[PDB]
Amino acid sequence: GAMDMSWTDERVSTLKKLWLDGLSASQIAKQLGGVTRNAVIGKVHRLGL
């Protein structure tokens, strides 16, 4: 099966807060777990942040 984590409401809320807080995509990926820096960047892009 695929190992990609779903962008649950909680994971999105966490990403959004941390991004607005000024954390790097690397740091956010580390805190979310199971997702890469580049995948975080892509999600930030899709969220319009």
Short mmCIF file of C-alpha atoms in Angstrom, two decimals:
data_model
loop_
_atom_site.label_atom_id
_atom_site.label_comp_id
_atom_site.label_asym_id
_atom_site.label_seq_id
_atom_site.Cartn_x
_atom_site.Cartn_y
_atom_site.Cartn_z
CA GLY A 1 0.00 0.00 0.00
CA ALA A 2 0.92 3.69 -0.23
CA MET A 3 2.63 5.25 2.82
CA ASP A 4 1.57 8.86 2.17
CA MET A 5 -0.23 10.39 5.18
CA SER A 6 -3.65 11.96 4.66
CA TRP A 7 -3.93 15.69 5.23
CA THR A 8 -6.38 15.35 8.09
CA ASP A 9 -8.00 18.43 9.59
CA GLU A 10 -5.55 18.24 12.48
CA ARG A 11 -2.48 17.95 10.26
CA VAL A 12 -3.67 20.89 8.15
CA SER A 13 -4.38 23.01 11.23
CA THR A 14 -0.94 22.21 12.63
CA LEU A 15 0.82 22.95 9.34
CA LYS A 16 -1.01 26.25 8.99
CA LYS A 17 -0.23 27.44 12.54
CA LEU A 18 3.43 26.44 12.36
CA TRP A 19 3.87 27.98 8.93
CA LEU A 20 2.35 31.26 10.16
CA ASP A 21 4.63 30.97 13.23
CA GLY A 22 7.62 31.05 10.88
CA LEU A 23 8.77 27.43 11.10
CA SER A 24 10.58 25.96 8.09
CA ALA A 25 9.08 23.27 5.92
CA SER A 26 11.76 20.96 7.36
CA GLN A 27 10.74 21.65 10.94
CA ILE A 28 7.07 21.26 10.12
CA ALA A 29 7.68 17.94 8.36
CA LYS A 30 9.61 16.73 11.41
CA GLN A 31 6.80 17.70 13.78
CA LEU A 32 4.00 16.24 11.64
CA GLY A 33 5.89 13.01 11.03
CA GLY A 34 5.75 10.64 8.07
CA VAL A 35 5.91 13.42 5.47
CA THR A 36 8.81 15.15 3.71
CA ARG A 37 9.92 18.75 3.49
CA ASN A 38 8.91 19.00 -0.16
CA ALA A 39 5.48 17.51 0.48
CA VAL A 40 4.91 20.14 3.17
CA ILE A 41 5.89 22.84 0.66
CA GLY A 42 3.41 21.47 -1.85
CA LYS A 43 0.63 21.56 0.74
CA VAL A 44 1.51 25.14 1.76
CA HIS A 45 1.19 25.96 -1.92
CA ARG A 46 -2.22 24.29 -2.28
CA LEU A 47 -3.46 26.09 0.86
CA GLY A 48 -2.50 29.44 -0.64
CA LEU A 49 -0.26 30.37 2.30
#
